[PDB]
């Protein structure tokens, strides 16, 4: 619960958010840090979009292959 915004009402954050992006970023952050690739979390956020926008090229390959041919 965040009391720094919408003063004096505050905002319920976890009740009013789609957490999947953050969970993805936190998971990647903890995976990299486990190997001590101590990347700053800001970089993980900045470069998260290119990574999945690369994976979507493979998902699109398979999705079209199943409709037509390779």
């Amino acid at each position: 619960f965040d009391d720094r915004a919408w003063y004096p009402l505050g905002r319920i954050i976890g009740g009013t958010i789609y957490p999947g992006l953050m969970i993805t970023s936190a998971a990647i952050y903890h995976v990299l840090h486990f190997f001590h690739i101590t990347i700053d979390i800001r970089n993980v956020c900045v470069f998260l979009a290119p990574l999945f926008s690369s994976f979507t090229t493979i998902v699109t390959y398979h999705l079209t292959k199943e409709l037509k041919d390779a």
Binding site: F35, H36, I37, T38
Partner: protein
């Protein structure tokens, strides 16, 4: 103790900026007869009002070898007497009826207090100093004079003991005569001082050395303008239009970076700062740093400067033996004033037998352990603290450790496993 006296003293007090340098040429002389011993040392004393604020004290014999004529000084306590004392070892003993001239140099911090404590943009800055007319020393003084050099000729009030003469921006006192030991008389002066009252409230100096030919240094600096606090609004319009506006304000300062400093970056918590002008002189990389905003008194700012250096400018070696030399700290600006410095030196992991030849006393914390890309054991970190630091502390330090040939090649071997096992996972799958 043998009976020494201060047979002559000439004191220069320099108040031209946010620090109070004090110089005393003293002709220390031996009073004793031949029954007395040859005196090997003499005492110096700090006035209890100022001993809390003494940043540096140095002594040297009158003579051209300034780099070698520095005398060894030790902080000492005399039984039953209040205040800090220092013992100075002479290069040659002083015989009965001999004399020597020594020069004492001291720097006090925070001893110039704004008064009034608050000003508008258009008002000027006045500061009060409270020192002493007399050379506070354990020994009587035959005759002494003082010269006080002010930051500007606009003296508002001063203490008129002895009918002092005044000319331009200087005051001239005495001669006082046959002054007893430990004597005091509180010299007070109130005068205009517009010099840059900057204080580094905290700096973190991180030195990261690798045997990949690179040492990377980063200086997190917390900077406060300790001048007279701004009262009322900040008119941007008047600050642009009139040159008189905020004449105490700090626009910029210039940092003298190591001659070798490559890849100098200047950035913040919130991103880059595109305002620094960098110039590469043959002796030094001059860098003008302009903060994001001008500092009026009691405004604060924070920034990070770092840079890379080549190894062979500062490393030395004897096979398995390695030792970094460092000049002790960066020259952020002349007369820079720092409250609290934290220096971390991060050796390669597997550095062993770590020893350090500190130039002077510095608090040393237990070695941390630090983990970064491709680290497993972790890099051993030297951590030290000290406080109340000044430009005379840009001295030298040397640090000695053992390391081995193979350990650098271990790093790639440790990489390779992570991909080999990926391939093996594919095979098994």
């Amino acid at each position: 103790a043998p009976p020494l006296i201060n047979e002559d003293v000439k004191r220069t007090v320099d108040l031209s900026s946010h620090l109070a340098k004090v110089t005393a040429e003293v002709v220390l002389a031996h009073l004793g007869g031949g029954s007395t011993s040859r005196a090997t040392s003499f005492l110096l004393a700090l006035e209890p009002e100022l001993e809390a604020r003494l940043a540096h004290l140095g002594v040297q014999v009158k003579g051209e070898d300034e780099e070698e004529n520095n005398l060894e000084v030790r902080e000492t306590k005399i039984k039953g007497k209040s205040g800090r004392f220092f013992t100075v070892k002479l290069p040659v003993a002083l015989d009965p009826g001999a004399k020597i001239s020594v020069i004492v140099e001291t720097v006090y911090t925070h001893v110039l207090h704004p008064y009034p404590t608050q000003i508008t943009q258009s008002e000027k800055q006045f500061v009060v100093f409270e020192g002493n007319h007399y050379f506070y020393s354990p020994y009587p003084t035959k005759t002494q004079t003082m010269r006080v050099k002010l930051a500007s000729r606009n003296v508002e009030s001063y203490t008129k003991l002895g009918n002092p003469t005044r000319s331009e921006d200087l005051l001239d006192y005495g001669p006082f005569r046959d002054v007893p030991a430990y004597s005091q008389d509180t010299f007070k002066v109130h005068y205009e001082n517009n010099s840059p009252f900057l204080t580094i409230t905290s700096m973190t100096r991180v030195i990261e050395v690798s045997h990949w030919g690179n040492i990377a240094v980063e200086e997190n600096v917390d900077l406060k303008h300790t001048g007279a606090v701004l009262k009322g609004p900040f008119s941007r319009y008047d600050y642009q239009r009139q040159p008189d506006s905020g004449i105490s304000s700090i626009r910029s300062f210039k940092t003298i970076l190591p001659a070798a400093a490559q890849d100098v970056y200047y950035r913040d918590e919130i991103g880059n700062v595109s305002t620094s002008h960098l110039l590469i002189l043959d002796d030094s990389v001059e860098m003008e740093i302009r903060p994001r905003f001008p500092l009026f008194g009691g405004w604060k700012t924070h920034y990070i400067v770092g840079y890379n250096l080549p190894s062979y400018e500062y490393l030395y070696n004897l096979g398995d033996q390695y030792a970094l030399k460092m000049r002790f700290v960066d020259h952020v600006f002349d007369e820079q004033v720092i409250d609290s410095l934290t220096v971390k030196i991060i050796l390669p992991e597997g550095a062993k037998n770590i020893e350090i030849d500190s130039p002077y006393e510095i608090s040393r914390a237990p070695d941390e352990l630090h983990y970064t890309y491709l680290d497993t054991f972790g890099r051993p970190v030297i951590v030290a603290y000290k406080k109340n630091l000044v430009e005379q502390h840009i001295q030298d330090i040397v640090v000695h450790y053992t390391f081995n040939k193979v350990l650098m090649l271990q790093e790639p071997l440790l990489v390779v496993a992570a991909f080999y096992i990926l391939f093996f996972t594919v095979i098994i799958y």
